[PDB]
């Protein structure tokens, strides 16, 4: 029958300080045990005579407190519980250990949840990109603009240094929706992630802000920024992405934590917004997000460039269409592409998408050539593939032919007319802009041949 | 302010109740702080320890205290 | 085998009060130990017979309480736990130590400092810490303003008896207001530093964006902490300056107003507010005795741009051999010409410099040129963009240097970047435009040259 | 997770949101739908007001097929 305790301080006369039960003490030590090799926080055990007969492990269970300050001398720590009271405790041997570098212990730093024994005053243990530019269509201008501000500073650092030029901290991708704008952030996070002789990847989205789950979301905004600081003290680049930043704009924290990464130029912070109106301009100022890059509705040739990705020569094109081209696969697919791209951007009356009534009495018709997007090109593709499969099941012969694409286009357009969720205030801004008159009414036009019907649009 | 305190016997003789509150209102700058202090001073010496005080608006919602429903009780 | 305790009071007969194990007792002292050299709060040690045989150190671990004050005794303190309970505790000898003069340093104590305490023993033991070379010469085009600020700041502290001669109260605080990207904290740091050397002074900077922010305690205790941090240079005779950036983010408020008049009786401290929107600022903070001087950081004019580019364009930058070739190799007379020949292109009223079209209530449509809409941040943007152009110029063409071409094309690109996204504007600018015209503004759109990737935008107020 | 049970069981149900328009806080649904992406479970949803519906759930790869019941 024996008791246990937590050794607190080691003394030169072999006597040893111990926390146990009530009235915690210092005790005479057994000749068996050595007083030099004894370590702090280590749970020892004594006999009834209060002499320590064994040096054991450290307590593996108890309360959890989040660390507040790594402090000064010898490193006893300041910690916090979520009763929001603060406590100063000792650090056990394994914590202050000088053997650890930056499921494994690495050098501790604020934010870490630490296992502590409150009474004893001791903390023992701590508690815990495949796309390339080549894939992205019709963005040739934008991508160059991105690398110029991201890759070029990092590769040529001395050539920036000679011109007294500070490399930009972060980028703002803005524009209407449907290009998705994420593939760009992934693609720069990847094309940069191999500069050797993988360097990096990450992402985060705006929508989880008010969201909680594990922990309450007030200070998440810190933990992420230090996790970015891991590879900051490494020299391998890091890109912090904020999707749906128009959603966030309370704000104040981000603005500071962006300044925190100013001195460290090894981390980029990218963010994207589908309405640039609502963004607090404070975050757009020099030094925070320097490069503003507009991802814009694609035009006819950019549309071609996008279609080229979604039709590979690896897709089963029908024999009828190949025969026309002398069985040439690539030339056939190219030809189909310019066919449907030319069909899409026609100003024909069946391509009509919106009637826009301004304040001055004017009314203007928006064709679909202005409302295109990666989402809709992909949609046209997929529906055309579906028509290809249905054609094969019923007609029996393989292949996708141009008519599948065309009918897919008229059906996609018709679907938009009925449900025009593809439009956002960012569009009415540019329409109203080009006109020079405020817009009081918007509605969709239907060819009349469809089952789809005109609906009144009101945005904000 | 002066009149009811000086002449209380004359107020009572006419069955007049002395006012409790006084409102100063109008555009700024208009040193109404000074005006309150002035009337508080001219009254302050009538013999023959009349005190002095003021509080300002700015301390209401700010707390070294907690909610202000406390303070409005210990000042009075 | 022996236990510990915490010394509470020493007596004359060698008997002593010591806290051990959830109750209180009085013990005698071993002939070994000295009763006079013992100190309050010191962790002592008792043998099995309850007689203190040894004097030890102080308890280094325990609860943390924020100490508001040291009461009438001076041997006790009233501390507040983070559960919002208040508690009186005894002050240990090292805390009350009169050895400690007036930031991790041995000091005396004062409200807001964090103290390490044992609650049932009632003893506070140890305090836990929480842990401007620019001059007017670097600031371009602002000479009017630097004159005004130096008048409101330097002149009072230089001549003080001449100020007391005319019975003139030196201003407590300064307002810096105007367009968003026009001027910055730079000016504040400049007056700070310029005043800083009168001999024969420490800066201070706090920006708005950390207010509502946690890690702190939100709306609650700190706002007076800084006013204490400034207070120690204030009773010194070495001036200190409290700068507030992003003040328009502050429009809860009440505390500051009391705190400004708190430093009002003090000759030695100045407070400088900086706001990008001055219609928002609560005039109470703006009325005399708080912020007396309103100094407008208005947008740079034609020449001021030259002055700023001068700061951003030095001799030290690589410059093309071809551009030096026309100037006979003189570098300064090359950059000078460049500067005025960008600034001239910039304030040009030509049709590619068109920034806005403002449609008023009465049907009048006025066009705004980037001329009126410039700012320091925009100029800096142009400079940097030109440097980048020069860099990738070097890369493909092989020949080093920044020519005038890069600057001009930087201008058009920057303008286009504003046409697409005019967040360089604000309601202040609309108020000024509308005020000048005499009409309310019912519509606003950016103008595009059509040559660019930039398109027109309706702007909402 | 419930649906995750009948996935491998080879007897799929479908997750039906009635009065979906009344739902739009949002964030979690998107992720949990992205979770069933590699599985074949279909998610049907119905709305009498398609105006209010946040297009985020309508972008391709989430609810792809919009079917009007007229």
In chain A, how long is the greatest CA-to-CA distance? 102
| C272 strand-pairing partners | C174, C243
Q: Measured between alpha carbons, how far is residue C309 from residues A167, C322, C349, C424 in Å?
A: 20, 21, 20, 19
Task: Give the chains touching B; criterion: ≥3 Cβ pairs < 8 Å.
Answer: C
CA distance A151 to A192: 6
Q: Which of C375, C373, C453 is nearest to C413 (CA)?
A: C453
Q: Which of C133, C151, C235, C245 is nearest to C194 (CA)?
A: C133
Q: Please, which residues have CB within 8 angstroms of residue C139's CB and are 6 or more apart in sequence?
A: C146, C186, C187, C190, C311
3-state SS class at A392: helix
**Identity of the residue in D56, D60, D66 whose CB atom sits nearest the CB atom of A419:** D66
Tokens of D26: 């949002």
Between strands A289-294 and A439-444, the pairing is: unpaired
Q: With beta carbons less than 8 A apart as the criterion, state whether C6 and C41 touch.
A: yes
Distances A20 to A27, A46, A119, C51, C280 between C-alpha atoms, Å: 11, 10, 10, 21, 61
Experimental method: X-ray
Q: Tell me: do C97 and C237 sit in the same domain.
A: no
Report the SS3 class of residue C68. strand
| C46 φ/ψ angles, rounded to the nearest 5 degrees | -110, 140
* B63: chain C residues, CB-CB within 8 Å: 220
Does any CB of chain D come closer than 8 Å to the CB of residue A411? no
Between CA C272 and CA C280 the distance in angstroms is 17
Contact yes or no, A with D (3+ CB pairs under 8 Å): yes
> Which of A86, A173, A298, A301 to mutate to probe the C interface, most C CBs <10 Å?
A86
The closest alpha carbon to A36, from A16, A6, A57, A58, belongs to: A16
Nearest in space to A272 (alpha carbons), one of A204, A190, A193:
A204
| Residues 6+ away with beta carbon under 8 Å from C132 | C189, C192, C193, C196, C203
Q: SS3 of C443, please?
A: strand
Phi, psi of C204 (to 5 degrees): -155, 140
The answer to whether the beta carbons of residues C374 and C299 sit under 8 Å apart is: yes
Residues C52 and C67 in one domain: no
C224 and C112 inside one domain: no
Q: Which helix (H) or strand (E) holds A273?
A: strand A267-273
For A378, the closest chain D residue by CA position comes to: D60
The CA–CA distances, whole Å, from B23 to A152, B19, B44 equal 69, 11, 19
CA distances from A459 to A104, A297, A349, A427 (A): 52, 19, 25, 10
Handedness of CA A219, A221, A227, A231 (dihedral sign): negative
Please state, in angstroms and rounded to a whole number, the distance separating the CA atoms of residues B26 and A80.
52
Nearest-5° angle of CA A432, CA A434, CA A438? 20
Q: How far apart are CA A125 and CA A385, in angstroms?
A: 56
The sign of the dihedral angle between the CA atoms of C132, A286, C389, A267 is positive
C272-308: burial string, b at 16+ Cβ within 10 Å, e else: bbbbbbbeebeeebbeeebbbbebbbbbbeeebbbbb
Report yes or no: A6 at the C interface, CB cutoff 8 Å. no
CA A407/CA A418 separation, integer angstroms: 17
Say yes or no: C165 and C69 in one domain: no
**β-pair partners for C65:** C115
Contact (Cβ atoms closer than 8 angstroms) between residue C241 and residue C272: yes
Q: Is B29's CB within 8 Å of C287's CB? A: yes
How far is residue C173 from each of residues B58, C224, C249, measured CA to CA in Å? Answer: 18, 17, 19
Query: Rounded distance, CA C282 to CA C303, Å?
Result: 34
Dist CA C412 CA C450 (whole Å): 12
Cβ proximity of A272 and A301 under 8 Å: no
Contact C183, C176 (CB under 8 A): yes
* First CA to last CA distance, chain B: 19
Give the mutation candidate from C61, C206, C318, C383 for the A interface (greatest A CB count, under 10 A). C61
Q: Which DSSP state fits A370? A: G
Q: What is the CATH number of the domain that holds A46?
A: 2.40.50.140
Q: Is C232 exposed, middle or buried (0-12, 13-18, 19+ CB in 10 A)?
A: middle
Residues of B with CB under 8 A from a CB of C: 28-29, 56, 58-64, 66
* CA A151 to chain CA centroid, nearest Å: 19
CA dihedral A245, A248, A250, A252 (to 10 degrees): 10
Q: Which residue of A has its CA nearest to C446?
A: A433
Query: What CA–CA distances, in Å, run from A375 to A77, A187, A422, D57?
Result: 53, 18, 9, 13
Among C191, C218, C215, CA closest to C203: C191
* Integer CA distances (angstroms), D7 to D2, D12, D16, in order: 9, 6, 16
Query: Please, are residues A64 and A116 in contact by the beta-carbon 8 Å criterion?
Result: yes
Alpha carbon separation from A279 to A173, A273, A274, A320 (Å, rounded):
12, 8, 10, 52
Pairing assessment for the beta strands A16-19 and A3-10 based on DSSP bridges: antiparallel
Q: In what order do the strands lie in the sheet with C293-296?
A: C240-244, C269-275, C173-177, C293-296
- By C-alpha distance, the chain A residue nearest C363 is A360
Mutation to test the C interface, candidates A47, A157, A252, A459, most C Cβ within 10 Å: A252
- D61 touches A at CB < 8 Å: no
Q: Which of A88, A152, A173, A260 to mutate to test the interface with C (most CBs of C within 10 A)?
A: A88
Taking the C-alpha atoms of residue C367 and residue C441, their distance in angstroms, rounded to an integer, is 13
- What is the domain range of residue C101? 63-128
D9 DSSP β-pair partners: none
Cβ count within 10 A of residue C256: 23
* Rounded distance between C-alpha atoms, residue A178 and residue A368, angstroms: 14
DSSP 8-state secondary structure symbol assigned to residue A349: T
Same domain, A50 and A81: no
CB-based contact C258 B29, cutoff 8 Å: no
User: Do residue C26 and residue C123 come from a single domain?
Assistant: no
**Same domain assignment for residues C108 and C142:** no
**Together in a domain, C109 and C198:** no
Rounded distance between C-alpha atoms, residue A96 and residue A113, angstroms: 15
Q: Residue A242: which CATH number? A: 3.40.50.300
What token pair was written down for C414?
């920057």
- Is the peptide bond between A197 and the residue preceding it cis, with omega within 30 degrees of 0? yes
Contact C201, C240 (CB under 8 A): yes
How many CB atoms are located within 10 Å of the residue A316 CB?
11
Q: Number of A to D CB contacts under 8 A, please give it.
A: 37
Nearest Cα to Cα of residue C148 among C298, C301, C300:
C298
- Whether A43 and A159 map to the same domain: the answer is no
Closest A-chain CA to C442 = A438
Q: Which of A211, A415, A422 sits opposite D27 (nearest CB)?
A: A211
| Residues C164 and C220 occupy one common structural domain | yes
Q: SS3 for C365?
A: strand
Does residue C158 share a domain with residue C31? no
Nearest to A292 by CA among C424, C313, C356: C424
Beta bridge partners of C441: C360
Q: How many CA atoms lie within 13 A of A133 on its CB side?
A: 16
Phi, psi (deg, nearest 5) at residue C235: -90, 5
- Distance, C-alpha A25 to centroid of its chain: 53
Interface of C with B (CB under 8 A): 84, 220-221, 252, 254-255, 257-258, 283-284, 287-288
State both tokens at C1: 């085998």
Binding residues of A for ATP, by number, are: 178-183
Which of helix, strand or coil describes residue C258? helix
**The dihedral formed by the CA atoms of C258, C260, C265 and C266, expressed in degrees to the nearest 10:** 140
Cβ of residue A152 closer than 8 Å to a chain C Cβ = yes
The number of residues making up chain C comes to 461
Among C45, C81, C377, beta carbon nearest to A285: C377
Whether omega before C200 lies within 30 degrees of 0, making that bond cis, reads yes
- Beta strand C173-177 pairing with C269-275: parallel
Cross-chain Cβ contact C252/B28 below 8 Å? no
Where do breaks (C to N over 2.5 Å) occur in chain D, by preceding residue number?
24, 40
What is the number of helices (H) and of strands (E) in chain C?
A: 15, 17
* E strand segments, C164-306: 173-177, 240-244, 269-275, 293-296
- Among residues A211, A246, A241, A242, which one has the least CA distance to residue D28? A211
Q: Which of A56, A162, B35, B53 is CA-nearest to residue C401? A: A162
Q: Are residues A98 and A171 in the same domain?
A: no
Q: Which single residue is written with the structure tokens 């152009």?
A: C389
Task: Please tell me whether the peptide bond between B48 and the residue prior to it is cis, using omega within 30 degrees of 0.
Answer: yes
CB A414 within 8 A of CB A444: no
Question: How many alpha carbons fall within 13 Å on the CB side of residue D30?
Answer: 16
DSSP per-residue string spanning A76-143: -EEEE-TT--EEEEEEPHHHH-TT----------TT-EEEEETTTTEEEEEE-----GGG--S-HHHH
D28, two tokens: 């979690």
Structure's resolution in angstroms: 3.5
Tokens 């301390």 correspond to B59
CB contact C390 to A (< 8 Å): yes
Find the largest Cα–Cα distance for chain D: 37
CB-CB neighbours of A48 under 10 Å: 8
Closest residue in A to C445 (Cα) is: A433
8 Å CB contact of D68 and A419: yes
Least Cα separation, residue C319 to chain A (angstroms): 10
Going across the sheet that includes C441-446, the strands are C365-369, C354-360, C441-446
Bridge partners of A205, per DSSP, are A243
Half-sphere exposure at residue C354, Cβ-oriented, CA atoms within 13 angstroms:
17
Shortest CA gap C257–chain B (Å) = 7
Work out the number of other CB atoms within 10 angstroms of the CB of residue C187: 23
- Would you state the structure tokens that stand for residue A128, as one six-digit string? 């815990």
Q: Residue C440 — left, alpha, or beta (φ > 0 → left; ψ -120 to 50 → alpha)? A: beta
Cβ burial of C117 (10 Å; 0-12, 13-18, 19+) is: buried
Q: Which of A90, A286, A433 sits opposite C61 (nearest CB)?
A: A90
- Residues in contact with A349: Cβ distance below 8 Å, sequence separation at least 6, in sequence order: A447
Inter-chain touch B59–C258, beta carbons under 8 Å: yes
Contact C208, C247 (CB under 8 A): yes
DSSP character at residue C452: S
């Amino acid at each position: 029958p024996s008791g246990y305790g937590v050794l607190l301080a080691t003394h030169d006369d072999d006597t040893v300080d111990v926390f146990t039960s009530g009235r915690k003490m210092r005790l005479t030590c057994s000749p068996n045990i050595d007083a030099a090799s004894l370590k702090k926080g280590q749970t020892v055990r004594l006999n009834e005579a209060l002499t320590v007969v064994e040096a054991g492990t450290f307590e593996a269970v108890g309360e959890i407190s989040t660390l507040r300050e790594i402090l000064a001398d010898g490193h006893r720590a300041l910690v916090v519980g979520h009763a929001d009271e603060e406590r100063v405790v000792w650090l056990a041997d394994p914590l202050i250990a000088e053997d650890l570098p930056d499921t494994r212990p690495r050098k501790l730093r604020p934010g870490d949840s630490l296992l502590v024994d409150t009474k004893a005053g001791y903390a023992f243990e701590r508690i815990p990109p495949d796309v390339s530019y080549a894939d992205i269509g019709g963005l040739s201008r934008q991508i160059e603009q991105i690398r110029d501000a991201v890759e070029l500073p990092f590769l040529h650092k001395e050539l920036y240094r000679e011109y007294s030029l500070r490399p930009p901290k972060g980028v703002l991708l803005y524009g209407p929706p449907g290009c998705g704008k994420t593939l760009i952030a992934k693609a720069v996070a990847n094309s940069l992630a191999k500069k050797m002789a993988k360097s990096y990847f990450l992402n985060i989205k705006g929508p989880e802000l008010l969201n909680k789950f594990v922990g309450e979301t007030e200070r998440h905004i810190r933990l992420i920024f230090q996790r970015a600081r891991e590879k900051a003290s490494e020299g391998t680049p890091v890109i912090v992405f904020f999707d749906e930043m128009d959603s966030i704009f309370v704000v104040p924290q981000l603005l500071s934590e962006i300044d925190g990464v100013e001195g460290l130029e090894n981390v980029i912070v990218i963010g994207a917004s589908n309405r640039e109106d609502m963004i607090d301009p404070a975050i757009l100022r020099p030094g925070r997000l320097d490069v503003k890059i507009k991802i814009e509705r694609p035009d006819a040739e950019a549309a071609q460039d996008i279609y080229s990705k979604y039709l590979t020569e690896f897709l089963p094109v029908h024999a009828d269409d190949l025969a026309e081209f002398d069985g040439d696969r690539s030339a056939c697919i190219k030809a189909m592409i310019e066919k449907v791209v030319d069909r899409m951007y026609a100003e024909i009356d069946d391509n009509r998408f919106l009637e826009v009534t301004y304040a001055n009495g004017d009314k203007e018709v928006m064709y679909f050539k202005d409302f295109n997007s990666g989402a809709m090109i992909q949609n046209v593709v997929d529906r055309a593939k579906k028509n290809a499969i249905k054609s094969v099941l019923e007609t029996g012969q393989p292949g996708l032919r141009i008519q599948h694409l065309l009918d897919s286009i008229v059906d996609e357009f018709a679907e938009n007319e009925d449900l025009p969720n593809t439009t956002n205030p960012d569009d009415w801004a540019r329409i109203s802009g080009k006109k020079g008159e405020r817009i009081v009414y918007i509605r969709t036009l239907v060819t009349g041949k469809s089952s789809s019907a005109s609906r009144a649009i009101d945005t904000e | 302010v002066e009149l009811p305190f000086l002449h209380k016997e004359l107020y009572r003789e006419y069955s007049l109740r002395p006012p409790k509150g006084v409102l100063l209102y109008g555009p700024p700058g208009c040193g109404k702080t000074l005006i309150a202090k002035a009337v508080a001073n001219s009254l302050a010496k009538k013999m023959a320890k009349s005190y002095f005080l003021n509080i300002k608006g700015p301390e209401l919602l700010n707390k070294f205290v907690g909610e202000t429903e406390r303070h409005i009780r210990l000042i009075f």
